[PDB]
């Protein structure tokens, strides 16, 4: 039911909405570490306002694309992020938090006027192209390939994929569909010892071989998660809402 047409289209669009892979090196005043801090904060904001995970994914995509073409000073990085979260909310949420709420969350760092103006600038820079395919969007499709659906697998997959948002290096070089692939297999293997299923190999054209590089990176991120400076995602996935999947132990090997 359009499931195939939609997937094909998303595969097309994820290339067009892809951020510049090495943009951070061209940003004189901001680094991967600052970005990680920004994203980790947006995770908290998403939690505080009970926003959809998709909204979070969209906001990150807007941010990476904005910073791909616009030089930004560190003091304005949060303004970009706040506006990106505002736009993502408006696009994706049934009940977006109002602008005042986005002003309040910045702890009076910026005015409402600034937030509003940054919103319009972000829209201009992205030329209104906000319907970006996300890691989350591919994951949900990938999930339909379960029998039945395993709650822990899904949650743990959403968890890993979210972790990828924090670290521009190395995850900017992987397409969402690929990151979702590694996340789905890694989660599945951790939960049921099972692997990237054939039906998905046929759907995506991806094999454990093609997914290897990302998967090895993702595995390392998973293993080293407890020591990452940014911890909002782990804390979030401790909750029963996600079946405390962040308390699970990563596999030692993948084979």
């Amino acid at each position: 039911d359009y499931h195939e047409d939609i997937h094909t289209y998303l595969r097309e669009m994820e290339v067009k909405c892809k951020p510049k892979v090495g943009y951070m090196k061209k940003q004189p005043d901001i680094t991967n570490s600052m970005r990680a801090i920004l994203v980790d904060w947006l995770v908290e904001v998403g939690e505080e306002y009970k926003l959809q995970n998709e909204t979070l994914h969209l906001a990150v995509n807007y941010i990476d694309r904005f910073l791909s073409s616009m030089s930004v000073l560190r003091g304005k990085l949060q303004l970009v992020g706040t506006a990106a979260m505002l736009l993502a909310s408006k696009f994706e949420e049934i009940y977006p938090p109002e602008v005042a709420e986005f002003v309040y969350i910045t702890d009076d760092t910026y005015t409402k006027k600034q937030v509003l103006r940054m919103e319009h600038l972000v829209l201009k820079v992205l030329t209104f192209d906000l319907a970006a395919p996300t890691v989350n969007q591919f994951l949900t499709q990938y999930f339909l390939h379960q029998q039945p659906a395993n709650c822990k697998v899904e949650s743990l997959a959403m968890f890993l994929g979210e972790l990828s948002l924090i670290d521009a290096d190395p995850y900017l070089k992987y397409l969402p569909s690929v990151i979702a692939a590694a996340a789905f297999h890694l989660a599945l293997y951790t939960v049921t010892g099972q692997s990237w299923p054939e039906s998905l190999i046929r759907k995506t054209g991806y094999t454990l071989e093609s997914l290897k590089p990302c998967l090895l990176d993702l595995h390392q991120t998973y293993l080293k998660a407890p020591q990452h400076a940014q911890q909002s995602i782990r804390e979030k996935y401790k909750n029963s809402k996600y079946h405390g999947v962040s308390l699970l132990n990563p596999p030692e090997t993948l084979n």
Binding site: D1, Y2, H3, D5, I6, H7, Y9, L10, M13, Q52, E54, L86, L87, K90, F91, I94, P96, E98, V99, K112, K113, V115, L116, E119, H120, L123, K124, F128, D129, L130, A131, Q137, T140, Q141, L144
Partner: protein, 296 residues
């Protein structure tokens, strides 16, 4: 941003978020429809409807979807420049009240509408406000989907989306029953109602309220049971006290319609959204075998 090149000719209407004018490009001679959107520069900024309408419409290039030609930015205003079409389907129906719309044209219009909708659904977009007012025709016999201010990109599978959607008369049963989940099927339902309306010359379900609407549907298609609609009883706004009306003979529901027409319609108005026919699948229905492209 500057509109100095556009000369306003006459107003076409309003919507709440945007005022619409017929205008003329003074340099090229192109006639357009200008949609003016006020930005709430001291409060809420750019409206979410404009954000969705523009971002989605930019992805959708198809013969049967109105073309967004340009977006002109101002500090205070947004101007959407659309290709101009001569009339909407609602007004065309009023003008055709006495003589009715020729069946070959009804068939052509429905065929084209399904092509436009199929493209939408193929590109993960729900329209969610399909009604004759939002369907535009030209002198050549073309018809196009318009007004994407209520549209949204959906996911596979869907989440719960905005419940307050689709103009009452063209609103699907699952929405009225407060479904946790709805999808592409709601758009097909609307076209079903619109198909029937093109034929009979009046709205299929002109409800005066949500409960009236739901009951008008029940009295025509019969009250759905767990047999005809698996899961209906478990819908949030379903109540066992619902009166149980028998289904009406489609022959009566829409008299002028042939065997294939009635077949197509029944599938477009199937209760179970899972069984309700898709735009893609509808295009391959026998009813269109002999389709042509007449001019209004």
């Amino acid at each position: 941003g500057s509109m100095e090149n556009f000369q306003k000719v006459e107003k076409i209407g309003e919507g709440t978020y945007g005022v619409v004018y017929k205008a003329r490009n003074k340099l090229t001679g192109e006639v357009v429809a200008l949609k003016k959107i006020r930005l709430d520069t001291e409060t809420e900024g750019v409206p979410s409807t404009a954000i969705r309408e523009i971002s989605l419409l930019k992805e959708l290039n198809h013969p049967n979807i109105v073309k967004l030609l340009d977006v002109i930015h101002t500090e205070n205003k947004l101007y959407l420049v659309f290709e101009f079409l001569h009339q909407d389907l609602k007004k065309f129906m009023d003008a055709s009240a006495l003589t009715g719309i020729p069946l070959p044209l009804i068939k052509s219009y429905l065929f084209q509408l399904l092509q436009g909708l199929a493209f939408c659904h193929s590109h993960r977009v729900l329209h969610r406000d399909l009604k004759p007012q939002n369907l535009l025709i030209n002198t050549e016999g073309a018809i196009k989907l318009a007004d994407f201010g209520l549209a949204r990109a959906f996911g596979v599978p869907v989440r719960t989306y905005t419940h307050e959607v689709v103009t009452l008369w063209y609103r699907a049963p699952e929405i009225l029953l407060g479904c946790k989940y709805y999808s592409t099927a709601v758009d097909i339902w609307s076209l079903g109602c619109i198909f029937a309306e093109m034929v009979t010359r009046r709205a299929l379900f002109p409800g005066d309220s949500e409960i009236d609407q739901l009951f008008r549907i029940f009295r025509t298609l019969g009250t759905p049971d767990e047999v005809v609609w698996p899961g209906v009883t478990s819908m949030p706004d379903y109540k066992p006290s619902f009166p149980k009306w028998a289904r009406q003979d489609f022959s009566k529901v829409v008299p002028p319609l042939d065997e294939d027409g009635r077949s197509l319609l029944s599938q477009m108005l199937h209760y179970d959204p899972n069984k309700r026919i898709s735009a893609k699948a509808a295009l391959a229905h026998p009813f269109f075998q002999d389709v042509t492209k007449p001019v209004p």
